[PDB]
Amino acid sequence: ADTKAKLTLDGDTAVELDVLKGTLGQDVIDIRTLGSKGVFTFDPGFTSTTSCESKITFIDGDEGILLHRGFPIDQLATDSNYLEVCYILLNGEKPTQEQYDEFKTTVTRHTMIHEQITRLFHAFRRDSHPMAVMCGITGALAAFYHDSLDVNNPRHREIAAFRLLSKMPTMAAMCYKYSIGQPFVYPRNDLSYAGNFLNMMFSTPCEPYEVNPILERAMDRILILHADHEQNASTSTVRTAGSSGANPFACIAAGIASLWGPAHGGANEAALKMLEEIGKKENIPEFVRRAKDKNDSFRLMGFGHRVYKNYDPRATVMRETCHEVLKELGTKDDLLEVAMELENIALNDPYFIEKKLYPNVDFYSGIILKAMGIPSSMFTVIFAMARTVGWIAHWSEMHSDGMKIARPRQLYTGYEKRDFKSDIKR
Amino acid sequence: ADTKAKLTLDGDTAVELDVLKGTLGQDVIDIRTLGSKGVFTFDPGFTSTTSCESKITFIDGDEGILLHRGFPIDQLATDSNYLEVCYILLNGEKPTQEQYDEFKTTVTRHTMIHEQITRLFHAFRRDSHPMAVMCGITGALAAFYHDSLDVNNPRHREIAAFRLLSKMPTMAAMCYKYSIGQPFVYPRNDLSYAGNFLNMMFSTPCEPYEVNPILERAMDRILILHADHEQNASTSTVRTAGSSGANPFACIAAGIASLWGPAHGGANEAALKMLEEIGKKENIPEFVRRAKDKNDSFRLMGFGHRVYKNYDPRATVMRETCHEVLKELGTKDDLLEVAMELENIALNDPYFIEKKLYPNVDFYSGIILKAMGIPSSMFTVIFAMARTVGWIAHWSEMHSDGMKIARPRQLYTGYEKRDFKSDIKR
Amino acid sequence: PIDQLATDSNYLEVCYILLNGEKPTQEQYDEFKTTVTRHTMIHEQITRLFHAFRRDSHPMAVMCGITGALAAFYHDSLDVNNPRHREIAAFRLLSKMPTMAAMCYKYSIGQPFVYPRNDLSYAGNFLNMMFSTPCEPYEVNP
Ligand SMILES: NC(=O)C1=CN([C@@H]2O[C@H](COP(=O)(O)OP(=O)(O)OC[C@H]3O[C@@H](n4cnc5c(N)ncnc54)[C@H](O)[C@@H]3O)[C@@H](O)[C@H]2O)C=CC1
Numbered sequence: 006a007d008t009k010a011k012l013t014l015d016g017d018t019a020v021e022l023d024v025l026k027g028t029l030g031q032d033v034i035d036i037r038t039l040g041s042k043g044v045f046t047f048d049p050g051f052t053s054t055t056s057c058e059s060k061i062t063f064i065d066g067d068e069g070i071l072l073h074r075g076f077p078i079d080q081l082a083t084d085s086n087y088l089e090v091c092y093i094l095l096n097g098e099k100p101t102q103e104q105y106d107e108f109k110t111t112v113t114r115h116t117m118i119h120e121q122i123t124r125l126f127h128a129f130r131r132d133s134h135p136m137a138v139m140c141g142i143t144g145a146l147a148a149f150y151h152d153s154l155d156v157n158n159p160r161h162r163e164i165a166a167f168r169l170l171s172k173m174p175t176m177a178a179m180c181y182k183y184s185i186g187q188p189f190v191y192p193r194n195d196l197s198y199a200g201n202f203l204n205m206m207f208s209t210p211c212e213p214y215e216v217n218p219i220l221e222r223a224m225d226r227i228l229i230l231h232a233d234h235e236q237n238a239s240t241s242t243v244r245t246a247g248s249s250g251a252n253p254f255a256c257i258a259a260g261i262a263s264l265w266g267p268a269h270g271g272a273n274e275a276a277l278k279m280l281e282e283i284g285k286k287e288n289i290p291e292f293v294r295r296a297k298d299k300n301d302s303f304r305l306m307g308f309g310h311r312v313y314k315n316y317d318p319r320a321t322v323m324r325e326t327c328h329e330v331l332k333e334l335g336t337k338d339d340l341l342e343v344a345m346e347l348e349n350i351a352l353n354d355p356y357f358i359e360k361k362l363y364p365n366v367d368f369y370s371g372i373i374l375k376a377m378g379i380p381s382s383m384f385t386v387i388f389a390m391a392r393t394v395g396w397i398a399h400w401s402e403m404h405s406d407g408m409k410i411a412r413p414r415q416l417y418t419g420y421e422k423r424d425f426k427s428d429i430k431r
Numbered sequence: 432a433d434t435k436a437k438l439t440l441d442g443d444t445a446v447e448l449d450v451l452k453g454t455l456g457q458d459v460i461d462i463r464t465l466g467s468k469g470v471f472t473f474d475p476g477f478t479s480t481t482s483c484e485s486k487i488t489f490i491d492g493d494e495g496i497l498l499h500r501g502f503p504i505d506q507l508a509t510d511s512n513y514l515e516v517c518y519i520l521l522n523g524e525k526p527t528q529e530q531y532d533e534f535k536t537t538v539t540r541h542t543m544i545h546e547q548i549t550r551l552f553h554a555f556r557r558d559s560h561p562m563a564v565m566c567g568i569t570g571a572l573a574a575f576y577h578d579s580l581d582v583n584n585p586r587h588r589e590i591a592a593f594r595l596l597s598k599m600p601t602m603a604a605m606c607y608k609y610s611i612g613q614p615f616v617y618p619r620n621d622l623s624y625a626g627n628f629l630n631m632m633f634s635t636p637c638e639p640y641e642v643n644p645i646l647e648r649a650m651d652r653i654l655i656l657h658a659d660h661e662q663n664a665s666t667s668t669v670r671t672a673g674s675s676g677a678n679p680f681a682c683i684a685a686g687i688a689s690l691w692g693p694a695h696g697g698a699n700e701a702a703l704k705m706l707e708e709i710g711k712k713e714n715i716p717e718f719v720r721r722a723k724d725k726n727d728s729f730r731l732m733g734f735g736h737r738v739y740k741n742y743d744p745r746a747t748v749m750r751e752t753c754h755e756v757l758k759e760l761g762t763k764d765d766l767l768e769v770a771m772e773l774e775n776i777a778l779n780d781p782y783f784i785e786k787k788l789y790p791n792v793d794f795y796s797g798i799i800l801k802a803m804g805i806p807s808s809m810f811t812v813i814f815a816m817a818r819t820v821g822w823i824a825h826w827s828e829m830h831s832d833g834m835k836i837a838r839p840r841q842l843y844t845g846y847e848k849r850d851f852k853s854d855i856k857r
Numbered sequence: 858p859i860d861q862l863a864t865d866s867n868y869l870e871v872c873y874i875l876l877n878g879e880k881p882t883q884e885q886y887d888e889f890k891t892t893v894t895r896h897t898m899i900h901e902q903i904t905r906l907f908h909a910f911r912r913d914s915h916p917m918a919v920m921c922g923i924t925g926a927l928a929a930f931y932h933d934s935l936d937v938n939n940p941r942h943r944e945i946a947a948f949r950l951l952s953k954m955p956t957m958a959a960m961c962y963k964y965s966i967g968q969p970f971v972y973p974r975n976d977l978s979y980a981g982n983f984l985n986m987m988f989s990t991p992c993e994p995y996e997v998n999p
């Protein structure tokens with residue numbers, strides 16, 4: 006509260022405005038009182054504008070810091086596990102053994118989805134992108150779970166949330182199986198959250214599948230590292246749709262579509278295919294696949310970052326995890342040595358150095374998932390799946406906040422009142 | 432500009448911000464660069480922040496004014512038709528006979544949906560709410576229409592717009608047919624937009640259907656009166672989803688759910704149940720929901736509005752059409768004259784005048800709909816079907832602005848960094 | 858007396874008693890229980906019938922539906938004037954009724970159908986078909 010006294014605005018008359026500060030991050034000037042005084046600002050993008058108060062996740066992109074409930078991501082990535090991290094994001098505190106047991110038991114008990122929903126997957130085409138099917142099923146949930154749609158009911162929010170945490174991975178693995186023609190696999194209660202997901206993704210009735218504890222921890226880590234990322238395009242969507250009263254399932258569905266968004270962006274789309282194919286230690290290495298950048302599409306391949314200035318804090322543990330997985334799966338990684346090739350170019354190439362296309366958290370998750378035999382199309386599905394807990398938290402905080410349903414202003418510049426005189430005769 | 436001359440932001444030095452003027456409405460303060468210098472405004476509920484600049488629709492709350500590309504809603508609803516209004520909202524000017532016939536042809540020849548998309552209907556439960564099915568189906572279209580998901584490819588955007596505009600009526604009709612267990616009706620390239628919808632809604636293979644001209648016109652007007660409504664909640668969901676780059680169908684599915692949202696409260700449809708549930712002057716109204724109403728339970732049955740001060744300009748023509756409909760029908764009106772008592776109560780009950788709970792277009796819209804035999808479980812599906820052209824116009828505009836992404840800032844008031852230690856186990 | 862049977866015998870032996878007029882020898886009983894146990898699973902085409910019903914339907918109504926539909930699938934034992942038909946039909950009913958019942962239930966709650974297990978008693982098998990899921994092994998409380 007140093008010089009945080011307060012500031013003033015004026016054009017023909019003056020106004021008082023308080024200076025609010027956060028526990029971390031810069032100060033903000035409250036203008037919640039200017040609307041009434043007849044004063045409005047213009048910020049197409051919400052860059053200069055702060056629209057909410059949160060205590061979920063804290064980010065300082067310049068210093069490469071990411072905290073979830075004060076707890077640093079690196080620690081959580083190595084010291085906790087997805088469910089405990091989930092428990093932390095939604096409850097604001099680490100769990101006691103008892104609270105945790107109860108939490109994990111509630112999740113584990115509702116992993117199986119209604120058989121009528123399963124019947125939905127079968128109406129989709131086999132050739133469809135699993136991310137698209139994922140948005141389809143999740144957006145269809147409200148028709149089957151109409152018993153917990155009222156967000157103004159804390160008991161509904163509770164049930165809906167858990168339904169999502171438990172069922173997302175089940176839905177995800179069904180999107181995959183469906184895309185490769187193998188039978189759906191039921192959740193198993195004796196398996197951890199991650200071990201159960203790998204089993205639903207890979208096992209068949211032909212033989213017993215055994216999850217490699219190493220790959221299981223890696224998957225668990227891929228999840229923790231994608232649970233939440235503070236304010237962003239997809240979290241804003243979840244918040245915006247949420248404050249309109251939209252049911253939780255629909256909210257999570259719009260978040261999933263917002264996450265997928267940049268993928269089918271034409272310029273990005275074209276390039277991503279260029280990577281997911283051109284790689285015969287001829288091209289990629291001799292910057293052959295990198296002698297073609299008319300479109301950047303870098304972060305979509307895991308290069309550079311919007312928030313973080315020099316490195317993706319989440320990428321520290323994923324790289325070491327990445328190293329561990331590769332050594333575990335033995336060295337029959339010919340093509341997947343372009344991974345080592347690209348990292349070298351991202352760091353040593355003057356271009357990448359200058360424009361800072363440094364490997365982010367996805368560059369390594371991508372390498373881990375590939376190493377596991379997971380198709381490229383299932384990447385964002387798994388990220389959206391993990392990001393779900395983060396979306397619930399933001400949604401819960403949004404409502405359980407004050408539900409200040411905002412009815413935004415627009416600066417109009419269209420035609421002035423004019424009379425209509427159709428030129429058609431129908 | 433009146434008090435909109437020049438303004439200076441004062442901290443410990445002066446920051447002169449300029450005042451922007453709109454062709455109609457309020458002048459705003461330019462603050463696009465403030466954050467660009469560290470200073471962030473704080474405004475939840477967006478009481479002062481102008482979400483964007485738009486040329487589509489103008490609303491003057493206290494003046495009960497509503498314009499679409501400059502034309503008064505009264506003029507359009509009376510001497511225009513839904514398609515022509517679609518053209519104007521989308522193109523910015525009324526069409527020539529040639530532009531209209533070209534636009535109409537395309538709209539009619541894309542009204543049939545892919546057969547597989549029609550299979551997905553049979554996977555939902557027969558007791559599913561029409562609106563939840565409408566959301567589920569819409570949120571699943573991206574899986575099929577993968578050739579039109581590039582939000583940046585103008586050709587993709589055009590196809591996506593025509594696809595949504597053409598098929599929405601087809602799908603809304605099927606949601607009704609599936610709910611009551613009647614076979615689905617195909618589009619009729621020879622019928623008009625509203626007539627085709629009426630045909631798909633009530634025709635059966637058992638006998639040919641007659642499209643009453645007064646009902647045909649009533650419906651088209653309902654479509655016109657709901658074509659668009661400026662920067663509201665559902666549209667903010669669409670603009671924000673589209674900002675991330677989410678595909679056309681995902682954004683509209685988000686809009687639908689968002690438009691349905693303020694109707695999930697167990698007190699909502701509950702009070703909206705006793706309403707239509709009775710056809711007896713002295714049942715629904717004398718001495719009943721005096722307080723029997725719960726959440727909104729006023730504002731849900733077509734009473735009042737948070738944008739307009741004195742009245743809803745859309746109700747004018749809607750109230751006129753209501754008479755024409757109840758008059759024309761006879762059989763489906765008279766025993767439904769508990770409307771006049773509900774309206775009378777609104778125009779004289781001290782409680783209603785005290786809460787400005789005046790009858791809005793949706794009150795008169797419901798009457799026309801209840802008269803035509805449409806169940807209240809279809810009302811918002813129909814309102815959404817019409818609003819889609821609006822969502823499409825705003826989504827496009829947001830794009831034209833440069834795909835204005837919505838990833839705002841937060842005021843972090845949570846835990847400062849704190850070590851993480853887990854003494855438990857999973 | 859019913860009190861004795863309720864405490865001293867078991868459903869199948871009681872079934873054997875109602876249809877044969879006498880309590881069973883070990884051999885007669887073994888044969889009886891083996892005949893029942895061997896036909897608990899129903900034709901997969903009948904199972905396809907359950908799925909044409911609405912999920913919201915009363916399980917008693919679905920029960921009357923499937924049982925009244927059996928003659929179309931088991932047209933091989935409809936002539937009551939044939940003692941061999943009566944025999945087969947009867948057993949089909951004793952074995953399949955519980956299977957049909959648990960399918961009506963599962964269908965009403967959205968869980969997958971559970972196949973009969975031969976290692977389980979008539980009642981233990983019914984509880985398992987009513988309650989187990991593929992997610993974990995179900996253990997019937999004796
Ligand atoms: N935290 C809480 O109190 C929660 C309570 N529920 C309640 O559970 C009931 C079922 O809800 P849904 O899970 O949405 O059912 P749903 O309609 O998807 O149907 C799934 C069925 O399979 C069962 N199931 C799912 N996973 C299972 C597993 N791993 N082991 C054994 N059974 C499993 C479910 O209990 C349900 O019977 C409802 O009453 C719901 O409100 C659901 C989530 C959380």
Ligand SMILES: NC(=O)C1=CN([C@@H]2O[C@H](COP(=O)(O)OP(=O)(O)OC[C@H]3O[C@@H](n4cnc5c(N)ncnc54)[C@H](O)[C@@H]3O)[C@@H](O)[C@H]2O)C=CC1
Pocket residue numbers: 537539540541542543544545546578589590591593594618620
């Ligand atoms: N503005 C334009 O030129 C548009 C072109 N298209 C193109 O048309 C094809 C997709 O068309 P969709 O209708 O989305 O196919 P769809 O996947 O929805 O399947 C419907 C099929 O029946 C046809 N059809 C639809 N409505 C009809 C009607 N009322 N009468 C007779 N036939 C009808 C469609 O052309 C298509 O063959 C693609 O090539 C797409 O790019 C789609 C929309 C707009």
Ligand SMILES: NC(=O)C1=CN([C@@H]2O[C@H](COP(=O)(O)OP(=O)(O)OC[C@H]3O[C@@H](n4cnc5c(N)ncnc54)[C@H](O)[C@@H]3O)[C@@H](O)[C@H]2O)C=CC1
Pocket residue numbers: 892894895896897898899900901931944945946948949973975
């Ligand atoms: N007491 C007797 O002699 C009886 C003879 N049958 C005969 O058995 C044959 C099949 O009749 P349904 O049972 O009505 O077949 P059905 O048409 O329902 O089809 C069921 C199929 O699954 C088999 N099955 C059922 N439960 C089984 C189990 N627990 N273990 C292994 N296999 C099982 C059946 O044998 C049959 O192959 C026919 O020839 C029928 O006449 C049936 C009942 C009694």
